[PDB]
Amino acid sequence: RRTVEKTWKLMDKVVRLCQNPKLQLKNSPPYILDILPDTYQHLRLILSKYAQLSENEYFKIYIDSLMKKSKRAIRLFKEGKERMYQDRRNLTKLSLIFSHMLAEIKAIFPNGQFQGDNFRITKADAAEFWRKFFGDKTIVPWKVFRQCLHEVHQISSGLEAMALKSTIDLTCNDYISVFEFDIFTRLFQPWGSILRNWNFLAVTHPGYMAFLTYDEVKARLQKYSTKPGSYIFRLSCTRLGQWAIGYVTGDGNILQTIPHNKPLFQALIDGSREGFYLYPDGRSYNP
């Protein structure tokens, strides 16, 4: 708790810094003004229930992530000055990453207790991969993983690795827990063509907006009312491991679907067929 008294303390400076009126935070997911507070409430849940907690390696890496994370914001509010109303956009990249650190600690410690030992990963192939390789593990550094990842699904170049590090390392801490893992496995399934989809999808596809809000997505496709068929897809902070599809109707309107649990790969392949998905990001060509 010694360092976490130092962890919360840092987090309060930050919620202290954000609450500034000159910031006009339009708290639309994520709400840096809630995720952070909620993150504390849970640490109380977690610390309530628990030296066994002390040796938890993920807890250590995690709180390390949180604080390392906390001070950067402040430092940010420092460097930035007036700019505070690229240093800003950075702020958002963060409230985002905190949003995820939220979800993960929530997932590894449900109701307040450690259950990483038993995370049930959604896709099976996916699960045997990790079990086989990591088995008992809950968190794994980046290099290690990539290496194993590599024994099965070869990674074309140092460039692409990091780019993938980028897509799997949410919390941004150079480690990959079963969670950051379990989400990405569900995002880019099926397990066999793992890296194949990812590349075709979130790397060269004009239709991959990464994280976005339902208001922004609409916002963007308001520039295509004129052309129904135009669509784009995204991830969601409020529901990680999930893609939602936005597109414009022959009614001129803008609709939003979320596949239940059919991959994006097919969805788009099909929706494009009923002539639903035809001009990725209002762009002529569509793969």
Side-chain angles (χ1 to χ4, degrees), residues 42-44 51 53 56-59 61-62 65-67 70-71 73-79:
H42 197 82
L43 280 167
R44 309 278 273 156
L53 168 75
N56 194 299
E57 164 193 56
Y58 159 65
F59 210 71
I61 303 171
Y62 178 83
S65 250
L66 214 55
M67 321 264 259
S70 280
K71 311 177 169 190
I74 309 172
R75 143 134 298 167
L76 175 63
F77 270 90
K78 177 120 284 104
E79 318 293 271

CSV table of all heavy atoms in Angstrom, one decimal, residues 42-79, unseen atoms left out:
chain,number,residue,atom,x,y,z
A,42,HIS,N,-12.0,0.6,-6.9
A,42,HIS,CA,-11.6,-0.8,-7.0
A,42,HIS,C,-10.4,-1.2,-6.3
A,42,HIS,O,-10.4,-2.3,-5.6
A,42,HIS,CB,-11.5,-1.2,-8.5
A,42,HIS,CG,-11.6,-2.7,-8.8
A,42,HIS,ND1,-12.8,-3.3,-8.9
A,42,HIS,CD2,-10.6,-3.6,-8.8
A,42,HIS,CE1,-12.5,-4.6,-9.0
A,42,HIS,NE2,-11.2,-4.8,-9.0
A,43,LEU,N,-9.3,-0.4,-6.3
A,43,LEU,CA,-8.1,-0.7,-5.6
A,43,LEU,C,-8.4,-0.9,-4.1
A,43,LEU,O,-7.6,-1.5,-3.3
A,43,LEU,CB,-7.1,0.4,-5.8
A,43,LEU,CG,-6.4,0.2,-7.1
A,43,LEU,CD1,-5.7,1.4,-7.5
A,43,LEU,CD2,-5.6,-1.0,-7.0
A,44,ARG,N,-9.4,-0.2,-3.7
A,44,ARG,CA,-9.9,-0.3,-2.3
A,44,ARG,C,-10.5,-1.7,-2.2
A,44,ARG,O,-10.2,-2.4,-1.3
A,44,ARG,CB,-10.8,0.8,-2.0
A,44,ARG,CG,-10.2,2.2,-2.5
A,44,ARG,CD,-9.3,2.8,-1.4
A,44,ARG,NE,-10.0,3.6,-0.5
A,44,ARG,CZ,-9.6,3.8,0.8
A,44,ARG,NH1,-8.5,3.4,1.3
A,44,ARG,NH2,-10.5,4.5,1.5
A,45,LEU,N,-11.3,-2.0,-3.2
A,45,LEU,CA,-12.0,-3.4,-3.2
A,45,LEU,C,-10.9,-4.4,-3.1
A,45,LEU,O,-10.8,-5.1,-2.2
A,45,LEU,CB,-12.8,-3.6,-4.5
A,46,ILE,N,-10.0,-4.3,-4.1
A,46,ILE,CA,-8.8,-5.2,-4.2
A,46,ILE,C,-8.0,-5.3,-2.9
A,46,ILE,O,-7.6,-6.4,-2.4
A,46,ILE,CB,-7.9,-4.8,-5.4
A,47,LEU,N,-7.6,-4.2,-2.3
A,47,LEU,CA,-6.8,-4.1,-1.1
A,47,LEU,C,-7.6,-4.5,0.1
A,47,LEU,O,-7.1,-4.9,1.2
A,47,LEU,CB,-6.3,-2.7,-0.9
A,48,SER,N,-8.9,-4.4,0.0
A,48,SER,CA,-9.8,-4.8,1.1
A,48,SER,C,-9.6,-6.3,1.2
A,48,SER,O,-9.1,-6.7,2.3
A,48,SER,CB,-11.2,-4.5,0.7
A,49,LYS,N,-10.0,-7.0,0.2
A,49,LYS,CA,-9.8,-8.4,0.2
A,49,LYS,C,-8.5,-9.1,0.5
A,49,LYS,O,-8.5,-10.2,1.1
A,49,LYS,CB,-10.3,-9.0,-1.2
A,50,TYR,N,-7.4,-8.4,0.1
A,50,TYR,CA,-6.1,-9.0,0.4
A,50,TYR,C,-5.9,-8.5,1.8
A,50,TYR,O,-5.2,-9.3,2.6
A,50,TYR,CB,-5.1,-8.4,-0.5
A,51,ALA,N,0.6,-9.9,1.9
A,51,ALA,CA,1.8,-10.2,1.2
A,51,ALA,C,1.6,-11.0,0.0
A,51,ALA,O,2.5,-11.1,-0.9
A,51,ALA,CB,2.8,-10.8,2.2
A,52,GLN,N,0.4,-11.7,-0.1
A,52,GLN,CA,0.1,-12.6,-1.2
A,52,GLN,C,-0.2,-11.7,-2.3
A,52,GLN,O,0.0,-12.0,-3.5
A,52,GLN,CB,-1.1,-13.4,-0.8
A,53,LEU,N,-0.8,-10.5,-2.0
A,53,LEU,CA,-1.2,-9.6,-3.0
A,53,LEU,C,0.2,-8.9,-3.4
A,53,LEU,O,0.3,-8.5,-4.6
A,53,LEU,CB,-2.1,-8.5,-2.4
A,53,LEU,CG,-2.2,-7.3,-3.3
A,53,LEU,CD1,-3.1,-7.6,-4.5
A,53,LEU,CD2,-2.8,-6.1,-2.6
A,54,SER,N,1.1,-8.8,-2.5
A,54,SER,CA,2.4,-8.2,-2.7
A,54,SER,C,3.3,-8.8,-3.8
A,54,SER,O,4.1,-8.1,-4.5
A,54,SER,CB,3.2,-8.2,-1.4
A,55,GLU,N,3.3,-10.1,-3.8
A,55,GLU,CA,4.1,-10.8,-4.8
A,55,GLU,C,3.4,-10.9,-6.2
A,55,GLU,O,4.1,-11.3,-7.2
A,55,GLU,CB,4.5,-12.1,-4.3
A,56,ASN,N,2.1,-10.6,-6.2
A,56,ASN,CA,1.4,-10.6,-7.5
A,56,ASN,C,2.3,-9.8,-8.4
A,56,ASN,O,2.6,-8.6,-8.0
A,56,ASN,CB,0.0,-10.0,-7.5
A,56,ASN,CG,-0.9,-10.4,-8.7
A,56,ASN,OD1,-0.5,-10.0,-9.8
A,56,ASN,ND2,-2.0,-11.0,-8.4
A,57,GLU,N,2.8,-10.4,-9.5
A,57,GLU,CA,3.6,-9.8,-10.5
A,57,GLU,C,2.9,-8.8,-11.4
A,57,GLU,O,3.4,-7.8,-11.8
A,57,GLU,CB,4.3,-10.9,-11.3
A,57,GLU,CG,4.9,-10.5,-12.5
A,57,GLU,CD,5.2,-11.6,-13.4
A,57,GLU,OE1,4.3,-12.4,-13.6
A,57,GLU,OE2,6.4,-11.8,-13.8
A,58,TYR,N,1.6,-9.2,-11.7
A,58,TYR,CA,0.8,-8.3,-12.6
A,58,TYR,C,0.5,-7.1,-11.8
A,58,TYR,O,0.5,-6.0,-12.3
A,58,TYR,CB,-0.4,-9.0,-13.1
A,58,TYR,CG,-1.5,-8.0,-13.6
A,58,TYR,CD1,-1.2,-7.2,-14.7
A,58,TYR,CD2,-2.7,-7.8,-12.8
A,58,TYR,CE1,-2.2,-6.2,-15.0
A,58,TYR,CE2,-3.6,-6.8,-13.2
A,58,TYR,CZ,-3.3,-6.0,-14.3
A,58,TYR,OH,-4.3,-5.1,-14.6
A,59,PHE,N,0.1,-7.3,-10.5
A,59,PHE,CA,-0.3,-6.2,-9.7
A,59,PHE,C,0.9,-5.1,-9.7
A,59,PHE,O,0.6,-3.9,-9.9
A,59,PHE,CB,-0.6,-6.6,-8.3
A,59,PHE,CG,-1.6,-5.7,-7.6
A,59,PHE,CD1,-2.9,-5.8,-8.0
A,59,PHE,CD2,-1.2,-4.8,-6.6
A,59,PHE,CE1,-3.9,-5.0,-7.3
A,59,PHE,CE2,-2.2,-4.0,-6.0
A,59,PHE,CZ,-3.5,-4.1,-6.4
A,60,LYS,N,2.1,-5.6,-9.5
A,60,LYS,CA,3.3,-4.8,-9.5
A,60,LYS,C,3.5,-4.1,-10.8
A,60,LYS,O,3.7,-2.9,-10.9
A,60,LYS,CB,4.5,-5.6,-9.2
A,61,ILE,N,3.4,-4.8,-11.9
A,61,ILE,CA,3.6,-4.3,-13.3
A,61,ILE,C,2.5,-3.2,-13.6
A,61,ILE,O,2.7,-2.2,-14.2
A,61,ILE,CB,3.5,-5.3,-14.3
A,61,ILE,CG1,4.6,-6.4,-14.1
A,61,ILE,CG2,3.7,-4.7,-15.7
A,61,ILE,CD1,4.5,-7.6,-14.9
A,62,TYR,N,1.3,-3.6,-13.1
A,62,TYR,CA,0.1,-2.8,-13.2
A,62,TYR,C,0.1,-1.5,-12.5
A,62,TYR,O,-0.3,-0.4,-13.1
A,62,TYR,CB,-1.1,-3.6,-12.7
A,62,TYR,CG,-2.4,-2.7,-12.8
A,62,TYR,CD1,-3.1,-2.7,-14.0
A,62,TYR,CD2,-2.9,-2.0,-11.7
A,62,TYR,CE1,-4.2,-2.0,-14.1
A,62,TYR,CE2,-4.0,-1.3,-11.8
A,62,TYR,CZ,-4.7,-1.3,-13.0
A,62,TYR,OH,-5.9,-0.6,-13.2
A,63,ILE,N,0.4,-1.5,-11.2
A,63,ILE,CA,0.4,-0.3,-10.5
A,63,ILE,C,1.6,0.5,-11.1
A,63,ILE,O,1.5,1.7,-11.2
A,63,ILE,CB,0.6,-0.6,-9.0
A,64,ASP,N,2.7,-0.2,-11.5
A,64,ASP,CA,3.8,0.5,-12.1
A,64,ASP,C,3.4,1.3,-13.3
A,64,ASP,O,3.8,2.4,-13.6
A,64,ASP,CB,4.9,-0.5,-12.5
A,65,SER,N,2.4,0.6,-14.1
A,65,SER,CA,1.8,1.2,-15.3
A,65,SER,C,1.0,2.4,-15.0
A,65,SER,O,1.1,3.4,-15.7
A,65,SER,CB,0.9,0.1,-16.0
A,65,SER,OG,1.4,-0.4,-17.2
A,66,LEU,N,0.2,2.2,-14.0
A,66,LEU,CA,-0.7,3.3,-13.5
A,66,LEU,C,0.0,4.6,-13.1
A,66,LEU,O,-0.3,5.6,-13.6
A,66,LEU,CB,-1.5,2.8,-12.3
A,66,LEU,CG,-2.9,3.3,-12.2
A,66,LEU,CD1,-3.6,3.0,-13.5
A,66,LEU,CD2,-3.6,2.7,-11.0
A,67,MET,N,1.0,4.5,-12.2
A,67,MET,CA,1.8,5.6,-11.8
A,67,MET,C,2.7,6.2,-12.9
A,67,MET,O,2.7,7.4,-13.1
A,67,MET,CB,2.8,5.2,-10.6
A,67,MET,CG,2.3,4.2,-9.6
A,67,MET,SD,1.7,5.0,-8.1
A,67,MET,CE,3.0,4.8,-7.0
A,68,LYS,N,3.5,5.3,-13.5
A,68,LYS,CA,4.3,5.7,-14.7
A,68,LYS,C,3.3,6.6,-15.5
A,68,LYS,O,3.5,7.7,-15.8
A,68,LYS,CB,4.8,4.5,-15.5
A,69,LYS,N,2.1,5.9,-15.7
A,69,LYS,CA,1.1,6.6,-16.4
A,69,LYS,C,0.7,8.0,-15.7
A,69,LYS,O,0.7,9.0,-16.3
A,69,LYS,CB,-0.1,5.7,-16.5
A,70,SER,N,0.3,8.0,-14.4
A,70,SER,CA,-0.1,9.2,-13.7
A,70,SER,C,0.8,10.4,-13.8
A,70,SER,O,0.3,11.5,-14.1
A,70,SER,CB,-0.2,8.9,-12.2
A,70,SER,OG,-1.5,8.3,-11.9
A,71,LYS,N,2.1,10.3,-13.6
A,71,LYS,CA,3.0,11.4,-13.6
A,71,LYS,C,3.2,12.1,-15.0
A,71,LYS,O,3.5,13.3,-15.1
A,71,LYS,CB,4.4,11.0,-13.1
A,71,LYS,CG,4.5,10.2,-11.8
A,71,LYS,CD,5.9,9.7,-11.5
A,71,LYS,CE,6.0,9.2,-10.0
A,71,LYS,NZ,7.5,8.9,-9.6
A,72,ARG,N,3.0,11.3,-16.1
A,72,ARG,CA,3.1,11.8,-17.4
A,72,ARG,C,2.0,12.8,-17.7
A,72,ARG,O,2.3,13.8,-18.5
A,72,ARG,CB,3.0,10.6,-18.4
A,73,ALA,N,0.9,12.6,-17.1
A,73,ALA,CA,-0.2,13.5,-17.3
A,73,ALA,C,0.1,14.9,-16.8
A,73,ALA,O,0.0,15.9,-17.4
A,73,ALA,CB,-1.5,13.0,-16.6
A,74,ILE,N,0.5,14.9,-15.5
A,74,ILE,CA,0.9,16.0,-14.8
A,74,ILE,C,2.0,16.7,-15.6
A,74,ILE,O,1.9,17.8,-16.2
A,74,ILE,CB,1.4,15.6,-13.3
A,74,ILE,CG1,0.4,14.7,-12.7
A,74,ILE,CG2,1.6,16.8,-12.4
A,74,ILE,CD1,0.8,14.1,-11.4
A,75,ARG,N,3.2,16.0,-15.8
A,75,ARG,CA,4.3,16.5,-16.6
A,75,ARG,C,3.7,17.1,-17.9
A,75,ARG,O,4.2,18.2,-18.4
A,75,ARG,CB,5.2,15.3,-17.0
A,75,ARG,CG,5.8,15.3,-18.4
A,75,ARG,CD,7.2,15.0,-18.3
A,75,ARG,NE,7.9,16.0,-17.5
A,75,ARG,CZ,9.2,15.9,-17.0
A,75,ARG,NH1,9.9,14.8,-17.2
A,75,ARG,NH2,9.7,16.9,-16.4
A,76,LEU,N,2.7,16.5,-18.4
A,76,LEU,CA,1.9,17.0,-19.6
A,76,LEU,C,1.3,18.3,-19.4
A,76,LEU,O,1.4,19.2,-20.1
A,76,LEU,CB,0.9,15.9,-20.0
A,76,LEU,CG,0.0,16.3,-21.1
A,76,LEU,CD1,0.8,16.4,-22.4
A,76,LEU,CD2,-1.1,15.3,-21.3
A,77,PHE,N,0.6,18.3,-18.3
A,77,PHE,CA,-0.1,19.6,-17.9
A,77,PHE,C,1.0,20.6,-17.7
A,77,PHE,O,0.8,21.8,-17.8
A,77,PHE,CB,-0.9,19.4,-16.7
A,77,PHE,CG,-2.3,19.0,-17.0
A,77,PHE,CD1,-2.7,17.6,-17.0
A,77,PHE,CD2,-3.3,20.0,-17.2
A,77,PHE,CE1,-3.9,17.3,-17.4
A,77,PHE,CE2,-4.6,19.6,-17.5
A,77,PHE,CZ,-4.9,18.2,-17.6
A,78,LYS,N,2.2,20.1,-17.4
A,78,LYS,CA,3.3,21.1,-17.2
A,78,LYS,C,3.8,21.7,-18.5
A,78,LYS,O,3.5,22.8,-18.8
A,78,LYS,CB,4.5,20.4,-16.4
A,78,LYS,CG,5.7,21.3,-16.2
A,78,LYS,CD,6.1,21.5,-14.7
A,78,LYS,CE,5.2,22.5,-14.0
A,78,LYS,NZ,4.2,21.8,-13.1
A,79,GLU,N,4.5,20.8,-19.3
A,79,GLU,CA,5.0,21.2,-20.6
A,79,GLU,C,4.0,22.0,-21.4
A,79,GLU,O,4.4,23.1,-21.8
A,79,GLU,CB,5.4,19.9,-21.3
A,79,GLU,CG,6.0,18.8,-20.5
A,79,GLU,CD,7.4,19.1,-20.0
A,79,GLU,OE1,8.4,18.9,-20.8
A,79,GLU,OE2,7.5,19.7,-18.9
